[PDB]
Ligand binder design. Structure first.
Ligand SMILES: Nc1ncnc2c1ncn2[C@@H]1O[C@H](C[C@@H](N)CC[C@H](N)C(=O)O)[C@@H](O)[C@H]1O
Length: 443
């Protein structure tokens, strides 16, 4: 028949959508909310997960609808109200709910947000429900029609067109597909691939091994990591294929001294240690103390013992660890994350233009800090998970202009050429991984 969501399910997505605003990446929020409200059933877990990503993906469009109905941007409203309104608008417009579900929205959702806030906000929600269910979707503008096809803001659509041209439609298709796959890396230091595959297939988990990096596995969700034997023993870590390639490209050797200039939560720095076979030294810098504690949790659980974590600004060092002291440095630079809009769909709506240039300047000063850490024979790898030239090819052309003395080491495997020859790019619509950029440099 139709879509029937139980009361605990209604409270679940509301809390997930609310927490998704303050906990990033939003997957952690979804996990937290689902365990809080006891979503044990796989069928409910699937349905609510699908709705979760549908809301994230269409957030900006949903908000425009809320503004038409309510009269103001939902951004000035209470967080629980905003979350409830987003859930209700998405369910009413897209998911054709059964009478029981609309009843649970009316009574159980109103009550839930009241208990988290004040009776008046539940009442206000209750007063809006009928307007939402009677709302006639009306895309008038050629701009509004465009935004509804790609599920993206006009500025982003325009900016992608300037980069991909004919491929723009395919790009948005690939970041719009659903799709329930999670990418993980097998910790070779503590387990082997087939053993992990078998343990996953021992559960009801569908597994597909990556052809580009055989330690990467795609698993079909939902998958509980805090009850997983493989995860709690440190055999597996969540990482995209593109991110795994980064460490392999830099190619750190056992006994070398390596720097991960922006390291937390530690997907790549933990991978660098595998390639160095738990020998040598890794200096791991990150300004975020709360992200660094995750890296420390991963390091010891995964049996890593060569990582020295440093909660400091990465523009410092030199004169923290030394000048030309690194055999090779990885700069997986803080960035816009625009290449990850398939994985974290809501980012397409939260991104600004401004701050593309703000991130671009930070990357350059980390890049200058990286340059001075590299030994004469050493190598520097610069990566972002951004698709913008401003953060990528532009930042490398600048680097090759001011430095003296680096040169670009040509890259081919396993992805495609970037817009500067010798650089490499991954694309969602070409490679089924996140948008990514690679620049390998040596003195
Ligand atoms: N100036 C800075 N110094 C050190 N870390 C920074 C600085 N600016 C941003 N960061 C960190 O850069 C990180 C960006 C992430 N893309 C790093 C991911 C990491 N390389 C991984 O593979 O797990 C965030 O954790 C930021 O806290």
């Amino acid at each position: 028949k139709k879509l029937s969501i139980p009361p605990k399910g209604i409270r679940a997505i509301i809390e997930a959508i609310r927490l998704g605003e303050i906990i990033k990446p939003s997957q952690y929020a979804k996990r937290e909310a689902f365990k809080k409200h006891d979503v044990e059933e796989a069928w409910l877990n699937r349905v609510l997960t699908m709705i979760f990503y549908d809301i994230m993906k269409k957030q900006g469009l949903i908000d425009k609808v809320i503004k038409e109905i309510v009269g103001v941007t939902p951004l000035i409203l209470d967080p629980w109200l905003r979350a409830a309104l987003r859930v209700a608008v998405d369910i009413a417009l897209f998911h054709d709910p059964s009478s029981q579900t609309i009843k649970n929205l009316r009574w159980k959702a109103s009550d839930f947000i009241s208990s988290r806030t004040h009776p008046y906000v539940g009442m206000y929600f209750w007063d809006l429900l009928d307007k939402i269910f009677e709302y006639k979707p009306n895309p008038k503008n050629e701009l509004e029609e465009l935004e509804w096809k790609y599920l993206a803001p006009s500025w982003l659509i325009e900016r992608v067109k300037g980069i991909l041209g004919d491929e723009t439609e395919d790009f948005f298709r690939s970041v719009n597909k659903r799709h329930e796959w999670i990418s993980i890396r097998v910790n070779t230091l503590k387990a082997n691939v087939e053993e992990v595959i078998g343990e996953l297939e021992e559960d009801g988990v569908e597994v597909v091994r990556s052809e580009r990096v055989p330690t990467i596995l795609k698993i079909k969700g939902p998958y509980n990591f805090d009850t997983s034997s493989a995860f709690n023993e440190g055999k597996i870590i969540v990482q995209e294929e593109a991110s795994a390639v980064a460490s392999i490209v830099l190619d750190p050797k056992p006994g070398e001294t390596v720097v991960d200039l922006a390291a937390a939560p530690g997907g790549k720095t933990t991978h660098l240690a595998e390639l160095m076979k738990n020998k040598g030294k890794i200096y791991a810098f990150d300004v975020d103390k709360m992200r660094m504690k995750r890296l420390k949790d991963f390091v010891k659980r995964m049996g890593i013992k060569i990582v020295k974590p440093l909660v400091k600004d990465a523009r410092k060092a030199p004169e923290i660890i030394g000048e030309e002291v690194a055999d090779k440095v990885l700069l997986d630079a803080p960035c816009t994350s625009s290449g990850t809009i398939g994985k974290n769909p809501e980012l397409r709506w939260r991104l600004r233009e401004d701050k593309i240039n703000e991130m671009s300047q930070l990357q350059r000063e980390l890049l200058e800090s990286a340059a001075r850490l590299v030994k004469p024979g050493g190598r520097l790898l610069y990566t972002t998970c951004s698709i913008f030239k401003e953060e990528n090819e532009k930042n490398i052309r600048w680097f090759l202009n001011v430095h003296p003395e680096f040169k670009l080491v040509p890259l081919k495997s396993p992805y495609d050429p970037g817009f500067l020859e010798g650089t490499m790019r991954a694309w969602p619509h070409r490679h089924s991984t996140i948008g990514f950029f690679y620049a390998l440099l040596e003195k």
